[PDB]
Design a binder for these strands. Structure first.
Ligand SMILES: Cc1cn([C@H]2C[C@H](O)[C@@H](COP(=O)(O)OP(=O)(O)OP(=O)(O)O)O2)c(=O)[nH]c1=O
Ligand SMILES: [Ca+2]
Ligand SMILES: [Ca+2]
Ligand code: NA
Ligand code: NA
Length: 319
DNA sequence: CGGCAG
DNA sequence: ACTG
DNA sequence: CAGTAC
DNA sequence: GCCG
């Protein structure tokens, strides 16, 4: 659509993200998306200024791209950015870890493997560096969800297991599998992890653990047989009282969740993976000094409704 | 000025 | 929400 | 807590 | 980076 611009802008956006300038990177991100929501190639500097999320600086840069044919700033990106991206693509390693590794002289994953002090999570991330960067076919994601469900419904047939994330949004490929487990009885979800995970371990399905919380588990799995890659797996067990808000959170997308939660804030409300709250007292820094009333949200439609929004099917949330 | 989801 |  | 991830 |  406007790929003549976005391509060059995405490079600068990633340059900012890996370097730790999150908000400026966030600004570039929102502009990139907007430039993807336009239908007519931007033709004037004031045409860009008309686009939401595009300002004078961004408008000017896009003007430079049209007449000049390229963005000059792209040529002053630090030489460190490719290395910082390489390092930050290790699961468990962020900008702060990547910059420190660079300051310490590390420039390759061979350096990291041989010299860097890695956390347990990071050592698992490095081991699966190539696999965690690969997406998977929807069909494989189905096999993985079913594998978790059968293991869960074996020790309690009432458990409800739902694959969320990009899968539920109907995407052709999934970066990783996101499973939401609950129980309609309101109490039978408690303490299932210990046995659910052990069942999944004894089979060989679960290969590594990254996070093991009371409510969330994040780890690595590999389906049986030949030609299989290691895949990232997220499991969240929640009380039935929050099933709707959790399903909405875990279905996403991430930018959809952030926009909704921002809307709730304007309307004096707060939306979380746990509940949609009202009468939310907030302070100067847009900060919640006091919580309010949990609003009844038995279904996803209730959240949309309580927020004054038309219901959006999961596939309509892929922002 | 300062938030940008929780 | 987790981790250390 | 800071860092990281979802 | 944008925007109220
Ligand atoms: C990463 C992220 C996810 N989420 C929510 C919405 C996501 O759909 C859900 C799962 O996270 P992800 O699995 O990271 O996102 P995704 O499944 O939609 O895309 P992908 O195919 O690459 O896996 O968690 C947030 O609310 N905020 C975030 O920053
Ligand atoms: Ca996912
Ligand atoms: Ca995930
Ligand atoms: Na990382
Ligand atoms: Na070295």
């Amino acid at each position: 659509h406007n790929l003549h611009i976005t391509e060059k802008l995405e490079v600068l956006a990633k340059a900012y993200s890996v370097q730790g300038d999150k908000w400026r990177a966030l600004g570039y991100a929102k502009a990139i998306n907007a430039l993807k929501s336009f239908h007519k190639p931007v033709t004037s500097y004031q045409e860009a200024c008309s686009i939401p999320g595009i300002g004078k600086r961004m408008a000017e840069k896009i003007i430079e791209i049209l007449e000049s044919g390229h963005l000059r700033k792209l040529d002053h990106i630090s030489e460190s950015v490719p290395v910082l991206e390489l390092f930050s693509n290790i699961w468990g390693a962020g900008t702060k870890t990547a910059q420190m590794w660079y300051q310490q002289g590390f420039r390759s994953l061979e350096d990291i493997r041989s010299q860097a002090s890695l956390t347990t999570q990071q050592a698992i991330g490095l081991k699966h560096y190539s696999d965690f960067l690969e997406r998977m076919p929807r069909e494989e994601a189905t096999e993985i969800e079913q594998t978790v469900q059968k293991a869960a419904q074996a020790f309690n047939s009432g458990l409800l297991c739902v694959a969320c994330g990009s899968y539920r949004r109907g995407k052709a490929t999934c970066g990783d599998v996101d499973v939401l487990i609950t129980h309609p009885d309101g109490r039978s979800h408690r303490g299932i992890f210990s046995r659910l995970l052990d069942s999944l371990r004894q089979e060989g399905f679960l290969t590594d653990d990254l996070v093991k919380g009371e409510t969330k588990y994040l780890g690595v799995c590999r389906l049986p047989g030949p030609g299989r890659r290691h895949r990232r797996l997220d499991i969240i067990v929640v009380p039935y009282s929050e099933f709707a808000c959790a399903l909405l959170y875990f279905t996403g997308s991430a930018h959809f969740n952030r926009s909704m939660r921002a809307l709730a804030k304007t309307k004096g409300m707060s939306l979380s993976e746990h509940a949609l709250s009202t009468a939310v007292v907030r302070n100067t820094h847009g900060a919640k000094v006091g919580p309010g009333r949990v609003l009844p949200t038995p279904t996803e439609k209730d959240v949309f409704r309580l927020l004054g929004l038309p219901y959006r099917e999961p596939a309509e949330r892929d922002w």
